[PDB]
Write a protein that binds this ligand. Structure first.
Ligand SMILES: *[C@H](O)[C@H](C[C@@H]1CCNC1=O)NC(=O)[C@@H]1[C@@H]2[C@H](CN1C(=O)OCc1ccccc1)C2(C)C
Ligand SMILES: *[C@H](O)[C@H](C[C@@H]1CCNC1=O)NC(=O)[C@@H]1[C@@H]2[C@H](CN1C(=O)OCc1ccccc1)C2(C)C
Ligand code: NA
Ligand code: NA
Lengths: 304, 304
């Protein structure tokens, strides 16, 4: 009774366009009269090693940029660089432009990715921004410019644009102002993500989902303190739990009649003892990709 | 590098409407001038125990059916019953009607569900039709009339409409002609799904995905026969593997240079020996919700 659910993708689908510069094709985001795409579209293979993007952009003409919106070729009348994103001003506003915001998300928060190739949607899935500011996505060559988003009421909040894959096979990208999440740079060099930690508040959310869905074996009759729990958290590379985390879990706490520090005590035992070959919500591992809001949305059936 | 991916849901989002009959509200599918919804919308609580649907439908007037398409109230000018579905003919054709087909899917095949409440999309996720003709969905009260679908090229293939939850917490529903998948009836009585089996051909697909994504520990230097494998399959409640299954896996076989009967031998060892606390594509259990086509689509990046 509990699934990894993406937001409906319709409002974003109408914004996806193709952006080609020589042999290099990727996706763009067409909002009002502006197409946002990764700046590495202006790069040839050789200059991806240490590109001088300012110098490369100067060499570019509007006409070097082939922007298609399905069958339509869309006429670029201008180009500018904001951090690691290119803004291609176009002669036509997107008539399918939804109501939108650009937001910078926090590590631990979730969003939907609309994976595109050649400006066409392939698929939609839910992602978490890892504590080390990577995402564990499914992106191939051509996936760049694919976007991550949340929907609140009738408003699309864009939070991610895809730029690259790291050696570990995880993914990195920017906010829609072109500021990388984490320490990453848009050039083809070996780059280390931090050690990643498990998103403790999300694991608690998901244990609450497990209880709501009648799956309770792991509950014990013990409590604990933020202090003592955080000692075990540190030992298993779990993020420390703050009183903010405890306050955000209050609704799930109240719904289930299980105090947050009581759930923490249950999590302690799972980390120390493993799951003994048992499953929780049909998983053999502790899941950390569901925020407290994701759990509440899916158990209370919120719409858009 | 491998995720449970849903189809983009835009084309389906434009078809979802609200259908209310007394205190009973659920979702409808508005295609051309017809709204398709579960027939149990005409039911009061008491008559859900053993409804005479023919007699109940006779008592109904067009005006008993409140059909809203967002802010629009849509005027029902007719009602008919096809098996377990109600066709509410309306005065306006859906101007957002996509190109579509109604298809009856086979056990083992996957589809995207667009979970709706009050005619508004909440979320999208990928499902498999279990061998026992159930789905393991996330559906609350009000979710009925939510639809399952595939997209081929520019065509939406509707294959599922949601009707009910079984005692086990799994879900049952119909094709869009109102024929239940499996032995289920739309009345509030205890109903047994069969014993469910694991979709062997999908587990093989997913092991191929694991190899393509560099995750290979489980490969062994052994082969086997359909005959000998099916003896182990039967013992672990896996579906028997047919030469059709072997032919469908040919592309993944050819891509990886691993013969289907060689992968089967690897699966044999996993079933007999467990995973020794190892993970495959970040899972501690064998996944059976990915068809060979799903794997090929996601590793080759097919679009719509
Ligand atoms: C944009 O489509 C593309 C997406 C990558 C390619 C494979 N999976 C992805 O997520 N981004 C890039 O190609 C960037 C780009 C150059 C290299 N880079 C990158 O991801 O390097 C790793 C890579 C490349 C190709 C195949 C596998 C791995 C710069 C400018 C950062
Ligand atoms: C239609 O919205 C609704 C969806 C169920 C309710 C909870 N989760 C679901 O998938 N379908 C029904 O209510 C049908 C209907 C009557 C009963 N039934 C049903 O699912 O019974 C089980 C149930 C009901 C409510 C809450 C939990 C479980 C008939 C006519 C088959
Ligand atoms: Na131009
Ligand atoms: Na009417």
């Amino acid at each position: 009774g509990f699934r990894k659910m993406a937001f409906p993708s319709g409002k974003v689908e109408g914004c996806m366009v193709q952006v080609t510069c020589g042999t290099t094709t990727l996706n763009g985001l067409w909002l009002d009269d502006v197409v946002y795409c990764p700046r590495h579209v202006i790069c040839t293979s050789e200059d991806m090693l240490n590109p001088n993007y300012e110098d490369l952009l100067i060499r570019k003409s509007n006409h070097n940029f082939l922007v298609q919106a399905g069958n339509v070729q869309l006429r670029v009348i201008g180009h500018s660089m904001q951090n690691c994103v290119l803004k291609l001003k176009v002669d036509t506003a997107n008539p399918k432009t939804p109501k939108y915001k650009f937001v910078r998300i926090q590590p631990g928060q979730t969003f939907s990715v609309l994976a595109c190739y050649n400006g066409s949607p392939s698929g939609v899935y839910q992602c978490a921004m890892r504590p080390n500011f990577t995402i564990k996505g499914s992106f191939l060559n051509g996936s760049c410019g694919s976007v991550g988003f949340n929907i609140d009421y009738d408003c699309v909040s864009f939070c991610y644009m895809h730029h690259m894959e790291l050696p570990t096979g995880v993914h990195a990208g920017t906010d829609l102002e072109g500021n990388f999440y984490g320490p990453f740079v848009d050039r083809q060099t070996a780059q280390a993500a931090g050690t990643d930690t498990t998103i403790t508040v999300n694991v608690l959310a998901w244990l609450y989902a497990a209880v709501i869905n009648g799956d309770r074996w792991f509950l014990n009759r013990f409590t604990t303190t933020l202090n003592d729990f955080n000692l075990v958290a540190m030992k298993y590379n779990y993020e420390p739990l703050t009183q903010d985390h405890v306050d955000i879990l209050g609704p799930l706490s109240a719904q289930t009649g299980i105090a947050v520090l009581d759930m923490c005590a249950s999590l302690k035992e799972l980390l120390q003892n493993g799951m003994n070959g048992r499953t929780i919500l049909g998983s053999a591992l502790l899941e950390d990709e569901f925020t407290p809001f994701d759990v509440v949305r899916q158990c209370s059936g919120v719409t858009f």
